[PDB]
Amino acid sequence: DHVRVGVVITDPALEDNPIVYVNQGFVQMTGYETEEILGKNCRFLQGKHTDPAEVDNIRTALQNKEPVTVQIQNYKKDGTMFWNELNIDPMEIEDKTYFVGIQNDITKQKEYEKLLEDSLTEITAL
Template sequence: MKTLAFEEQLTLLEAMVDGSNVATIVTDPSQEDNPIIYTNRTFEKMTGYQQSEVLGRNCRFLQRKETDPMERKKIRTAIEAREGVTVTLQNYRKDGSLFWNRLHIEPVEVMGALYFIGTQTDVTLEHNQRQELTEKELEIEQIMLPILSLQDHVAAVALIGNMTHHRFDLLISKLSLYVQKERIEHVMIDVTGLYWEEGFPLEGLLSIRDVLKLMGTHLYVTGISPKAARELGTLQDQSRPLLTFSSIQQAMAFSQNGIR
Protein backbone atom coordinates (compact mmCIF):
# COMPACT_ATOMS: atom_id res chain seq x y z
CA MET A 1 0.00 0.00 0.00
CA LYS A 2 2.99 2.29 0.43
CA THR A 3 3.32 2.50 -3.37
CA LEU A 4 -0.23 3.82 -3.73
CA ALA A 5 -1.23 7.44 -3.58
CA PHE A 6 -2.96 8.56 -0.38
CA GLU A 7 -6.36 8.87 -2.06
CA GLU A 8 -5.99 5.39 -3.55
CA GLN A 9 -5.09 3.99 -0.15
CA LEU A 10 -8.22 5.51 1.36
CA THR A 11 -10.39 4.14 -1.44
CA LEU A 12 -8.89 0.67 -1.05
CA LEU A 13 -9.28 0.72 2.74
CA GLU A 14 -12.91 1.77 2.47
CA ALA A 15 -13.58 -1.01 -0.05
CA MET A 16 -11.96 -3.53 2.30
CA VAL A 17 -14.06 -2.36 5.25
CA ASP A 18 -17.26 -2.30 3.19
CA GLY A 19 -16.54 -5.82 1.96
CA SER A 20 -16.13 -7.16 5.48
CA ASN A 21 -18.78 -9.38 7.08
CA VAL A 22 -18.39 -7.37 10.28
CA ALA A 23 -20.34 -4.16 10.78
CA THR A 24 -18.06 -1.23 11.62
CA ILE A 25 -18.68 2.23 13.02
CA VAL A 26 -16.36 5.04 14.07
CA THR A 27 -17.30 7.60 16.72
CA ASP A 28 -15.69 10.89 17.71
CA PRO A 29 -15.59 11.45 21.49
CA SER A 30 -14.32 15.01 21.02
CA GLN A 31 -17.79 15.97 19.82
CA GLU A 32 -20.82 16.23 22.07
CA ASP A 33 -22.38 12.81 22.87
CA ASN A 34 -19.67 10.87 20.99
CA PRO A 35 -21.52 10.75 17.63
CA ILE A 36 -21.05 8.30 14.76
CA ILE A 37 -18.85 9.74 12.00
CA TYR A 38 -18.57 6.62 9.81
CA THR A 39 -20.38 3.34 9.14
CA ASN A 40 -19.66 0.63 6.60
CA ARG A 41 -22.20 -1.06 4.36
CA THR A 42 -22.39 -4.15 6.55
CA PHE A 43 -23.70 -1.94 9.35
CA GLU A 44 -26.44 -0.71 7.01
CA LYS A 45 -27.38 -4.29 6.08
CA MET A 46 -27.34 -5.45 9.70
CA THR A 47 -29.42 -2.61 11.15
CA GLY A 48 -31.49 -1.38 8.20
CA TYR A 49 -30.26 2.19 8.78
CA GLN A 50 -28.57 4.08 5.98
CA GLN A 51 -25.38 5.92 6.80
CA SER A 52 -27.08 9.28 6.26
CA GLU A 53 -29.62 8.40 8.97
CA VAL A 54 -27.08 7.70 11.70
CA LEU A 55 -24.20 10.12 11.15
CA GLY A 56 -24.08 12.60 14.02
CA ARG A 57 -26.06 10.33 16.38
CA ASN A 58 -24.88 8.35 19.38
CA CYS A 59 -25.25 4.63 18.64
CA ARG A 60 -27.50 4.09 21.67
CA PHE A 61 -30.46 4.50 19.29
CA LEU A 62 -30.01 0.77 18.62
CA GLN A 63 -30.89 0.09 22.25
CA ARG A 64 -34.18 -0.02 24.11
CA LYS A 65 -35.18 -0.33 27.75
CA GLU A 66 -34.86 -4.12 27.45
CA THR A 67 -31.13 -3.78 26.74
CA ASP A 68 -29.10 -5.01 29.72
CA PRO A 69 -28.16 -1.92 31.80
CA MET A 70 -25.02 -3.64 33.10
CA GLU A 71 -23.70 -4.11 29.56
CA ARG A 72 -24.50 -0.49 28.78
CA LYS A 73 -22.60 0.58 31.87
CA LYS A 74 -19.55 -1.40 30.72
CA ILE A 75 -19.57 0.61 27.49
CA ARG A 76 -19.81 3.96 29.28
CA THR A 77 -17.06 3.01 31.73
CA ALA A 78 -14.71 1.88 28.96
CA ILE A 79 -15.27 5.02 26.90
CA GLU A 80 -14.67 7.26 29.91
CA ALA A 81 -11.47 5.34 30.65
CA ARG A 82 -10.46 5.30 26.95
CA GLU A 83 -10.22 1.51 27.06
CA GLY A 84 -11.39 -1.34 24.86
CA VAL A 85 -14.41 -3.45 25.78
CA THR A 86 -16.48 -6.34 24.39
CA VAL A 87 -20.15 -6.77 25.26
CA THR A 88 -23.17 -8.62 23.90
CA LEU A 89 -26.22 -6.40 23.63
CA GLN A 90 -29.87 -6.73 22.80
CA ASN A 91 -30.23 -4.30 19.87
CA TYR A 92 -33.02 -3.39 17.47
CA ARG A 93 -33.05 -2.83 13.72
CA LYS A 94 -34.84 0.02 12.00
CA ASP A 95 -37.88 -2.21 11.45
CA GLY A 96 -38.04 -2.93 15.19
CA SER A 97 -36.80 -6.52 15.00
CA LEU A 98 -34.48 -7.74 17.74
CA PHE A 99 -30.95 -8.98 17.18
CA TRP A 100 -28.11 -9.84 19.54
CA ASN A 101 -25.03 -7.76 18.86
CA ARG A 102 -21.53 -8.70 19.97
CA LEU A 103 -19.91 -5.29 20.09
CA HIS A 104 -16.18 -4.70 20.44
CA ILE A 105 -15.03 -1.13 20.99
CA GLU A 106 -11.40 -0.13 20.64
CA PRO A 107 -9.90 3.36 21.14
CA VAL A 108 -7.65 4.52 18.28
CA GLU A 109 -5.51 7.64 18.19
CA VAL A 110 -4.92 9.25 14.79
CA MET A 111 -2.63 12.28 14.56
CA GLY A 112 -3.31 13.13 18.19
CA ALA A 113 -7.09 12.76 17.90
CA LEU A 114 -8.98 9.99 19.72
CA TYR A 115 -11.63 7.91 17.99
CA PHE A 116 -13.52 4.76 18.92
CA ILE A 117 -13.90 1.96 16.40
CA GLY A 118 -16.82 -0.35 17.06
CA THR A 119 -17.09 -3.72 15.32
CA GLN A 120 -20.44 -5.46 15.51
CA THR A 121 -21.34 -9.10 14.86
CA ASP A 122 -24.87 -10.48 14.73
CA VAL A 123 -24.79 -13.43 17.16
CA THR A 124 -28.56 -13.95 17.32
CA LEU A 125 -28.38 -17.58 16.14
CA GLU A 126 -25.63 -18.41 18.61
CA HIS A 127 -27.53 -16.72 21.46
CA ASN A 128 -30.78 -18.52 20.62
CA GLN A 129 -29.02 -21.90 20.49
CA ARG A 130 -27.45 -21.24 23.87
CA GLN A 131 -30.84 -20.18 25.23
CA GLU A 132 -32.42 -23.40 23.95
CA LEU A 133 -29.75 -25.45 25.72
CA THR A 134 -30.38 -23.54 28.95
CA GLU A 135 -34.13 -24.09 28.64
CA LYS A 136 -33.57 -27.82 28.06
CA GLU A 137 -31.42 -28.01 31.18
CA LEU A 138 -34.13 -26.22 33.16
CA GLU A 139 -36.70 -28.60 31.71
CA ILE A 140 -34.59 -31.53 32.87
CA GLU A 141 -34.52 -30.12 36.39
CA GLN A 142 -38.28 -29.55 36.31
CA ILE A 143 -38.94 -33.07 35.01
CA MET A 144 -36.90 -34.43 37.88
CA LEU A 145 -39.31 -33.85 40.75
CA PRO A 146 -38.01 -32.23 43.94
CA ILE A 147 -36.46 -34.34 46.66
CA LEU A 148 -39.09 -34.79 49.35
CA SER A 149 -38.54 -35.42 53.03
CA LEU A 150 -40.85 -38.28 54.08
CA GLN A 151 -39.83 -38.32 57.73
CA ASP A 152 -36.69 -37.83 59.81
CA HIS A 153 -33.64 -38.98 57.86
CA VAL A 154 -35.76 -40.40 55.01
CA ALA A 155 -36.11 -38.76 51.58
CA ALA A 156 -37.70 -39.68 48.26
CA VAL A 157 -37.43 -38.52 44.65
CA ALA A 158 -39.55 -39.60 41.68
CA LEU A 159 -38.01 -39.93 38.23
CA ILE A 160 -40.10 -39.12 35.17
CA GLY A 161 -39.28 -39.56 31.50
CA ASN A 162 -36.08 -40.89 29.97
CA MET A 163 -33.00 -40.84 32.21
CA THR A 164 -29.91 -39.87 30.21
CA HIS A 165 -26.35 -39.93 31.53
CA HIS A 166 -26.61 -36.18 32.05
CA ARG A 167 -29.75 -36.55 34.14
CA PHE A 168 -28.15 -39.25 36.28
CA ASP A 169 -25.11 -37.02 36.86
CA LEU A 170 -27.44 -34.18 37.84
CA LEU A 171 -29.38 -36.45 40.20
CA ILE A 172 -26.21 -37.73 41.87
CA SER A 173 -25.02 -34.17 42.47
CA LYS A 174 -28.42 -33.03 43.75
CA LEU A 175 -28.88 -36.03 46.02
CA SER A 176 -25.36 -35.82 47.46
CA LEU A 177 -25.85 -32.21 48.50
CA TYR A 178 -29.28 -32.91 49.97
CA VAL A 179 -28.17 -36.02 51.87
CA GLN A 180 -25.21 -34.20 53.37
CA LYS A 181 -27.23 -31.13 54.33
CA GLU A 182 -30.24 -32.97 55.79
CA ARG A 183 -28.30 -35.96 57.20
CA ILE A 184 -30.44 -38.41 55.28
CA GLU A 185 -29.98 -42.11 56.05
CA HIS A 186 -32.48 -43.63 53.60
CA VAL A 187 -33.26 -42.50 50.03
CA MET A 188 -36.21 -43.83 48.01
CA ILE A 189 -36.00 -43.40 44.23
CA ASP A 190 -39.33 -44.13 42.57
CA VAL A 191 -39.14 -45.17 38.91
CA THR A 192 -42.87 -45.58 38.25
CA GLY A 193 -42.86 -42.70 35.74
CA LEU A 194 -39.53 -43.64 34.20
CA TYR A 195 -39.25 -45.14 30.73
CA TRP A 196 -36.24 -46.55 28.94
CA GLU A 197 -35.61 -47.43 25.33
CA GLU A 198 -32.44 -49.50 25.61
CA GLY A 199 -32.91 -51.57 28.74
CA PHE A 200 -33.37 -50.72 32.40
CA PRO A 201 -30.92 -47.97 33.49
CA LEU A 202 -29.22 -50.22 36.00
CA GLU A 203 -25.76 -48.68 35.85
CA GLY A 204 -27.09 -45.22 36.64
CA LEU A 205 -28.92 -46.47 39.72
CA LEU A 206 -25.91 -48.51 40.83
CA SER A 207 -23.76 -45.37 40.57
CA ILE A 208 -26.21 -43.52 42.80
CA ARG A 209 -26.26 -46.45 45.23
CA ASP A 210 -22.46 -46.54 45.44
CA VAL A 211 -22.15 -42.77 46.01
CA LEU A 212 -24.81 -42.83 48.73
CA LYS A 213 -23.18 -45.85 50.35
CA LEU A 214 -19.95 -43.88 50.76
CA MET A 215 -22.01 -41.28 52.63
CA GLY A 216 -23.54 -43.91 54.91
CA THR A 217 -26.94 -43.73 53.20
CA HIS A 218 -29.05 -46.62 51.90
CA LEU A 219 -30.81 -46.56 48.52
CA TYR A 220 -34.18 -48.17 47.82
CA VAL A 221 -35.59 -48.30 44.29
CA THR A 222 -39.39 -48.37 44.22
CA GLY A 223 -42.07 -48.64 41.56
CA ILE A 224 -40.46 -51.71 40.02
CA SER A 225 -42.82 -53.35 37.53
CA PRO A 226 -42.79 -57.10 36.81
CA LYS A 227 -41.03 -56.35 33.50
CA ALA A 228 -38.33 -54.31 35.23
CA ALA A 229 -37.95 -56.99 37.89
CA ARG A 230 -37.28 -59.58 35.19
CA GLU A 231 -34.71 -57.36 33.50
CA LEU A 232 -32.99 -56.67 36.80
CA GLY A 233 -32.81 -60.37 37.55
CA THR A 234 -30.75 -60.96 34.43
CA LEU A 235 -28.67 -57.78 34.50
CA GLN A 236 -27.46 -57.11 38.00
CA ASP A 237 -24.62 -58.69 39.92
CA GLN A 238 -26.26 -60.75 42.64
CA SER A 239 -23.30 -60.08 44.95
CA ARG A 240 -24.34 -56.41 45.15
CA PRO A 241 -28.01 -56.20 44.14
CA LEU A 242 -30.18 -53.12 44.30
CA LEU A 243 -32.80 -53.08 47.02
CA THR A 244 -36.02 -52.92 45.00
CA PHE A 245 -39.67 -52.68 46.01
CA SER A 246 -42.98 -52.36 44.22
CA SER A 247 -43.99 -49.34 46.32
CA ILE A 248 -42.56 -46.65 48.58
CA GLN A 249 -44.69 -48.01 51.43
CA GLN A 250 -42.91 -51.37 51.23
CA ALA A 251 -39.53 -49.66 51.17
CA MET A 252 -40.49 -47.51 54.18
CA ALA A 253 -41.52 -50.59 56.16
CA PHE A 254 -38.26 -52.29 55.27
CA SER A 255 -36.15 -49.29 56.30
CA GLN A 256 -37.96 -49.01 59.64
CA ASN A 257 -37.30 -52.67 60.42
CA GLY A 258 -33.64 -52.23 59.60
CA ILE A 259 -31.50 -53.70 56.88
CA ARG A 260 -30.82 -57.36 57.34
Protein backbone atom coordinates (compact mmCIF):
# COMPACT_ATOMS: atom_id res chain seq x y z
CA ASP A 1 0.00 0.00 0.00
CA HIS A 2 1.26 3.41 -1.10
CA VAL A 3 -0.22 6.90 -0.74
CA ARG A 4 -2.76 7.64 -3.47
CA VAL A 5 -5.47 10.28 -3.50
CA GLY A 6 -9.09 9.29 -3.84
CA VAL A 7 -10.93 10.59 -6.89
CA VAL A 8 -14.68 10.37 -7.43
CA ILE A 9 -17.07 11.90 -9.93
CA THR A 10 -20.74 12.37 -9.04
CA ASP A 11 -23.79 12.90 -11.26
CA PRO A 12 -26.03 15.61 -9.77
CA ALA A 13 -28.79 14.89 -12.33
CA LEU A 14 -29.36 11.57 -10.55
CA GLU A 15 -31.22 11.08 -7.28
CA ASP A 16 -28.99 12.16 -4.36
CA ASN A 17 -25.94 13.02 -6.51
CA PRO A 18 -24.37 9.53 -6.49
CA ILE A 19 -20.77 8.53 -7.26
CA VAL A 20 -20.56 7.34 -10.87
CA TYR A 21 -16.75 6.96 -11.00
CA VAL A 22 -14.28 6.02 -8.26
CA ASN A 23 -10.53 5.28 -8.50
CA GLN A 24 -8.59 2.52 -6.79
CA GLY A 25 -6.93 5.13 -4.55
CA PHE A 26 -10.32 5.76 -2.90
CA VAL A 27 -10.90 2.02 -2.51
CA GLN A 28 -7.53 1.62 -0.76
CA MET A 29 -7.99 4.78 1.34
CA THR A 30 -11.49 4.03 2.64
CA GLY A 31 -11.68 0.21 2.74
CA TYR A 32 -14.83 0.08 0.61
CA GLU A 33 -14.79 -1.83 -2.69
CA THR A 34 -16.02 -0.26 -5.95
CA GLU A 35 -19.37 -2.12 -5.80
CA GLU A 36 -20.03 -0.65 -2.32
CA ILE A 37 -19.25 2.86 -3.57
CA LEU A 38 -20.81 3.33 -7.02
CA GLY A 39 -24.38 4.61 -6.76
CA LYS A 40 -24.01 6.12 -3.28
CA ASN A 41 -23.67 9.71 -2.11
CA CYS A 42 -20.19 10.40 -0.69
CA ARG A 43 -21.63 11.21 2.76
CA PHE A 44 -21.19 7.55 3.81
CA LEU A 45 -17.62 8.61 4.73
CA GLN A 46 -19.00 10.77 7.54
CA GLY A 47 -19.21 9.76 11.17
CA LYS A 48 -19.31 10.74 14.82
CA HIS A 49 -16.82 13.65 14.77
CA THR A 50 -17.51 15.01 11.28
CA ASP A 51 -18.01 18.75 11.81
CA PRO A 52 -21.62 19.53 10.79
CA ALA A 53 -20.57 23.12 10.03
CA GLU A 54 -18.19 21.87 7.31
CA VAL A 55 -20.84 19.51 5.92
CA ASP A 56 -23.04 22.63 5.70
CA ASN A 57 -20.25 24.49 3.88
CA ILE A 58 -19.90 21.64 1.36
CA ARG A 59 -23.70 21.56 0.80
CA THR A 60 -23.64 25.33 0.11
CA ALA A 61 -20.62 25.08 -2.23
CA LEU A 62 -22.43 22.43 -4.28
CA GLN A 63 -25.59 24.55 -4.47
CA ASN A 64 -23.56 27.56 -5.60
CA LYS A 65 -21.19 25.59 -7.88
CA GLU A 66 -18.15 27.02 -6.09
CA PRO A 67 -14.97 24.99 -5.77
CA VAL A 68 -14.27 24.07 -2.15
CA THR A 69 -11.28 22.63 -0.25
CA VAL A 70 -11.94 21.60 3.34
CA GLN A 71 -10.36 19.37 6.00
CA ILE A 72 -12.99 17.02 7.38
CA GLN A 73 -13.03 13.94 9.63
CA ASN A 74 -14.09 10.84 7.72
CA TYR A 75 -14.28 7.12 8.51
CA LYS A 76 -13.13 3.97 6.74
CA LYS A 77 -15.35 0.90 6.39
CA ASP A 78 -13.64 -0.61 9.46
CA GLY A 79 -14.45 2.56 11.51
CA THR A 80 -10.96 4.12 11.47
CA MET A 81 -11.05 7.91 11.54
CA PHE A 82 -8.92 9.78 9.05
CA TRP A 83 -8.57 13.47 8.31
CA ASN A 84 -9.57 14.09 4.72
CA GLU A 85 -8.36 17.17 2.85
CA LEU A 86 -11.24 17.22 0.39
CA ASN A 87 -11.39 19.24 -2.81
CA ILE A 88 -14.61 19.46 -4.83
CA ASP A 89 -14.69 21.05 -8.29
CA PRO A 90 -17.89 21.69 -10.23
CA MET A 91 -17.43 21.10 -13.93
CA GLU A 92 -19.25 20.38 -17.18
CA ILE A 93 -19.38 17.46 -19.63
CA GLU A 94 -21.56 17.92 -22.74
CA ASP A 95 -23.31 20.93 -21.18
CA LYS A 96 -24.28 18.96 -18.04
CA THR A 97 -22.88 19.63 -14.55
CA TYR A 98 -20.73 17.07 -12.69
CA PHE A 99 -18.65 17.25 -9.54
CA VAL A 100 -15.08 15.95 -9.24
CA GLY A 101 -13.93 15.13 -5.71
CA ILE A 102 -10.34 14.53 -4.60
CA GLN A 103 -9.72 13.00 -1.17
CA ASN A 104 -6.34 13.28 0.53
CA ASP A 105 -5.73 11.20 3.63
CA ILE A 106 -3.58 13.62 5.61
CA THR A 107 -3.50 11.33 8.65
CA LYS A 108 -1.77 8.63 6.59
CA GLN A 109 0.43 11.21 4.84
CA LYS A 110 1.66 12.43 8.24
CA GLU A 111 2.29 8.90 9.54
CA TYR A 112 4.22 7.85 6.42
CA GLU A 113 6.28 11.05 6.30
CA LYS A 114 7.23 10.58 9.97
CA LEU A 115 8.50 7.03 9.29
CA LEU A 116 10.78 8.29 6.51
CA GLU A 117 11.98 11.34 8.45
CA ASP A 118 12.88 9.18 11.47
CA SER A 119 14.75 6.57 9.36
CA LEU A 120 16.78 9.29 7.64
CA THR A 121 17.67 10.74 11.06
CA GLU A 122 18.67 7.27 12.28
CA ILE A 123 21.03 6.90 9.29
CA THR A 124 22.85 10.18 10.01
CA ALA A 125 23.22 9.10 13.67
CA LEU A 126 25.42 6.27 12.39
